[PDB]
């Protein structure tokens with residue numbers, strides 16, 4: 001609506017990087033305590049901003065936890081922009097490789113990884 | 127000689143590390159209950175028996191020991207007459223190690239420790255990579271003596287996030303891997319020293335930090351509170367300060383930065 005204390009505004013939505021490392025479910029559960037979701041990325045400009053604002057490996061809201069191979073945003077947005085690392089997603093580890101991290105030094109490109117990993121994250125609401 | 131016939135063609139179709147799904151085709155004629163018996167093949171054993179209702183042609187057996195060989199049999203009883211038993215053997219999968227942790231982190235190494243599996247594993251396969259998801263490194267770690275096994279991963283890139291998977295190994299068989307992540311520290315510049323020590327300027331040298339950084343940051347403090355800062359690109363290995371008090375007896379710190387991470391400090395004095 002304008003932008004709260006600790007959040008910063010980009011193209012209609014408000015954003016907050018949390019440095020504390022959490023599992024993907026706990027990160028998403030934290031985001032939802034603030035009426036929010038792990039960030040979805042729908043345009044290149046949003047990629048660049050969310051990467052540039054964090055400058056760190058971080059969870060985003062993309063995951064294939066309910067149907068293996070079928071990546072979806074935690075906030076229900078359709079998947080219309082993708083920026084995967086070479087050969088990803090690959091479901092490398094058969095246990096729980098269903099959650100997506102932004103590799104910040106590689107243009108913020110995405111890798112699917114174990115959801116039990118503990119990583120920083122960015123939340124997003126309107 | 128079993129008067130009455132019973133259930134046959136027993137099958138174990140799927141097996142985790144502590145669970146087996148047992149399946150069989152039911153007896154043709156009347157039977158008032160079914161017996162399912164199972165236990166370790168290793169003599170020091172004893173069987174568990176469940177009495178099941180005749181409709182059932184399947185049952186999930188639970189709380190089994192990982193990496194162990196079991197016998198399972200199924201039969202029928204009617205009055206005082208037990209039928210023939212259909213029996214098969216099967217082996218539970220190897221369980222993944224539990225409680226992975228990191229101890230010492232440095233710029234180029236991570237110390238890992240985990241609880242040994244309940245199953246017999248002579249070795250652990252440790253598989254790792256940065257989260258950028260390049261090709262993985264692999265390492266066989268002999269089982270530690272106690273309840274625990276340790277290893278140290280070396281020659282890692284500073285300031286980066288690694289994903290690690292550890293599998294218990296006996297024979298050609300593997301448990302699924304257990305996973306965790308860890309961040310290496312950022313490497314520090316060492317041996318920052320004086321080259322010149324003039325009344326207006328100080329020409330510093332320093333041992334280059336290692337691995338990918340963005341820039342160095344020299345902070346210089348003469349008086350109690352007031353402290354100023356400068357930046358220096360990756361390439362550089364020396365800088366000259368220029369705006370200072372005359373012979374002011376500083377103490378100067380340098381640090382490497384990449385993204386949100388900074389390295390530990392280095393320091394010498396200048397007069």
Ligand SMILES: [Ca+2]
Nearest residue numbers: 068096097098
């Ligand atoms: Ca999955």
Ligand SMILES: [Ca+2]
Nearest residue numbers: 064091097098
């Ligand atoms: Ca997956």
Ligand SMILES: [Ca+2]
Nearest residue numbers: 090111112113
């Ligand atoms: Ca992957």
